[PDB]
Amino acid sequence: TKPLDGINVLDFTHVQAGPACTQMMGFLGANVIKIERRGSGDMTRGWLQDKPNVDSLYFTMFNCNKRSIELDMKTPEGKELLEQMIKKADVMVENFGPGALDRMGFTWEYIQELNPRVILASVKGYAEGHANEHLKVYENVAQCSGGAAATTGFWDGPPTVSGAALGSSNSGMHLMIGILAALEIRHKTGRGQKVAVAMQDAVLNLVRIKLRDQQRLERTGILAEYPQAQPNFAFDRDGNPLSFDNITSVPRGGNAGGGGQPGWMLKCKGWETDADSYVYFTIAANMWPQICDMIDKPEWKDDPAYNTFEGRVDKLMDIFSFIETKFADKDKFEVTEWAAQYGIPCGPVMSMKELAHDPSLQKVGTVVEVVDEIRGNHLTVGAPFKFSGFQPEITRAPLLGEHTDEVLKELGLDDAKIKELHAKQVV
Amino acid sequence: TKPLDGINVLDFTHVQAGPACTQMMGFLGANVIKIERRGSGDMTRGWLQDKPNVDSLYFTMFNCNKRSIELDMKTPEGKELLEQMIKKADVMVENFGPGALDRMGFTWEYIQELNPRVILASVKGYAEGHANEHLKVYENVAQCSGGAAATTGFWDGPPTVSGAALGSSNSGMHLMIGILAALEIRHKTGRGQKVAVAMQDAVLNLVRIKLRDQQRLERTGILAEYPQAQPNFAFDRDGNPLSFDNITSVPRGGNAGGGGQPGWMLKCKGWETDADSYVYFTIAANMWPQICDMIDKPEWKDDPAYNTFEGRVDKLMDIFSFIETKFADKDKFEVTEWAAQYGIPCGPVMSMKELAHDPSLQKVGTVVEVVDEIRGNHLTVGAPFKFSGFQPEITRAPLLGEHTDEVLKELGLDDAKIKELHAKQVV
Ligand SMILES: CC(C)(COP(=O)(O)OP(=O)(O)OC[C@H]1O[C@@H](n2cnc3c(N)ncnc32)[C@H](O)[C@@H]1OP(=O)(O)O)[C@@H](O)C(=O)NCCC(=O)NCCSO
Ligand SMILES: CC(C)(COP(=O)(O)OP(=O)(O)OC[C@H]1O[C@@H](n2cnc3c(N)ncnc32)[C@H](O)[C@@H]1OP(=O)(O)O)[C@@H](O)C(=O)NCCC(=O)NCCSO
């Protein structure tokens, strides 16, 4: 049936990294109970609201398939309720500051005593043992810490953050691997473990290819697939020439190919007024005859100045600028269809508007309309992994404290005790 | 212990997306057998080599903890060997182009018949059922299809690819989630499933916050925290003011926060000569009093135009221009310290040079020195999830076909048939 049916998750998370992890677990069938601050809740509820006093799309897109209980954990009665909840949980997830759970009385040691089967999973800024262990970090600071910012953007501009959530959502997906790995250990040992993912580390994992580059640069002095290896192409803001003679750390390479074959971002019709009217166009080394046919340069097929990767190093940017002239009168999609006829990896820059209403992504369940009769329906991203014998059923995000009484009832508390906790401001 | 100890992985993968998945399963204890083409093998072997006739760092950094066998699969005797290997495998992983494995005769349907416990795990460019289902896709093509390029970069520049591998390794890590979720399904049903991750979809999942923004924009006409909603700050190509008039798709926001918590990328001493001499500075609403102390401006505490997120939406870039001047004679690390005292999320742009040789990252096993006695040692990224009861043991990447006979003997074949496979040009 569903992979995580019958898995109970005690979810202390807030913001993005932690909640992305537990939401996706929820999508795969987990029973996720979200513990929130009494009164305000997860701060995404109030961040960037489109309607005042309605939970923001920030909250709803990260907290589907979850229930909510308000709990003040700084009270002693709040701690005893947590212990009951820990004893019934298979995994606890937290992305609080570095030592916050510990300060609350719940160290890994004490959790093991309460439930020797439970898995404790956390997101942190930096790994335990790191000099910067104790630092609070959000999305973009993590991108900077893990090498993405340094290697994203242009040689003549600043380190640039990625629009993708490399620090936070990525950390949450990384933690999901850790939790699932820990569930596989537990099948063998009958015991829970602690797993942790540092945001710096989740970022650095995606930037593996740039650590390849750093070593290539140290060993050889050149990165031949980068624009700066073309003589007299790249310049700094004062017009000084940029070459690998003077580069000792992997530079920004604009829209160069990364771990793909060489490529560039080429303008299509309307690029002046439409910010997303571009394609990415790849010059794979085994496809030069095809490219030559497409752009009507038969003379470039047998010329060694043009027909190997090595021959193209000194002129690759000129070749891209010439290919680009062939797209001046065609939109993204026509250029993509044209290239497809040749088998050339090439695709449009899809705008968020285009993605939000794309039939294909709705059909395959990647962009999903959530039914929310309280707030109005909204779109979210569903499960990016598609299975032959299981479909996710995405349900709306909880109102703050919506399930508090319902959850306290599942723990076995009589109606009178639930009454008292409301009065003492515990729940 | 070792999470995937005893899990047998038949690994057809090549390039980045698939190999990152299987390598990481290998780090967690899985037994990974990499099937490669005779003669050339995985295309990363020969891709941007730093030494002639030595496996490239592209290959070594993505194929540690794996054994290698060469196989001609377009041969009848090769197809028979695969059948036998499929009978002994828990998961097959593949990232050939659309229909490639099917064309070899190994459809999901036939695979089930051969071993009803096996998991088939696949990376493609686009999801099955998508209009672009049949297209071949590298790294940056997926960044473009999944919305990242459209939303990364500056408002007066092109769509920009991330240096991080959003398309390839990111898909690989999502596929790992999918595979481990199928192993959990299998504990219940006794049966294998097919799992697939589309590169477009793995990208989209990390761009969830931008689909939030797209809906905020459709509903309200504005994104108040984006540079373009700041009065007379952003300008287009021509000397011309930008605003959310006529913006209907989420625009590029340079180095803006991307969420509920504003930030920017600020220069530090050395920025003209050092591409990575910068910090990122987040302005968390709840830490606004803490910020006013370090900035040496006590006036902003009581001012209602400066003490709330709402009051700050029209002079965000004025505050950042000012905070930047107090960094002009301190390096990255000095500025990061000068904060930190105050608990401020602010950190340095780390260069690849700094990360490759950083003591902390090597202490925690995130950057790892691989002992490779054939090729010379190299660095790699280790496991980004850290466990209380388990340490990865990373071992060197295999030579092409280094383990062919070893693997052919584990299948129960004799010495003399191993010879005739060599002579018939199948192994
Ligand atoms: C997000 C953040 C950077 C900043 O968080 P913050 O605004 O400083 O809050 P915090 O540090 O998590 O929590 C403050 C305290 O309140 C407490 N708290 C949280 N929820 C509580 C509740 N319901 N009841 C009582 N106390 C609670 C915590 O115990 C914490 O401990 P201390 O007072 O002893 O320091 C930090 O939580 C963090 O570093 N998290 C890890 C990184 C991460 O996962 N970020 C993801 C999203 S990034 O875009
Ligand atoms: C990456 C890539 C674009 C490369 O494309 P390509 O170089 O043209 O290779 P391919 O299309 O995968 O394989 C070519 C053929 O050789 C075959 N092949 C592969 N290994 C073989 C072997 N050992 N013996 C015989 N044939 C083999 C395939 O069956 C395929 O056969 P067809 O003629 O029936 O299509 C493509 O594999 C792809 O789209 N993969 C899926 C998406 C992906 O993961 N890309 C990420 C790469 S990381 O950026």
Curated annotation (Swiss-Prot), chains A, B:
pH dependence: Optimum pH is between 6.5 and 7.5.
GO BP annotation list: oxalate catabolic process
Consequence of changing residue 47 to F: Little change in the affinity binding and catalytic efficiency, and it does not display major structural changes
Main location: cytoplasm
Positions that bind CoA: 14-17, 37, 71-74, 95-97, 103, 136-139
Locations listed in the record: Cytoplasm
InterPro entries recorded: CoA-transferase_III_domain, CoA-Trfase_fam_III, CoA-Trfase_III_dom3_sf, CoA-Trfase_III_dom_1_sf, Formyl_CoA_transfer
Function: Involved in the catabolism of oxalate and in the adapatation to low pH via the induction of the oxalate-dependent acid tolerance response (ATR). Essential enzyme for the bacterium survival, as it relies on oxalic acid as its sole source of energy. Catalyzes the transfer of the CoA moiety from formyl-CoA to oxalate. It can also use succinate as acceptor.
Complex and partners: Homodimer.
Protein name as catalogued: Formyl-CoA:oxalate CoA-transferase
Gene this protein is translated from: frc
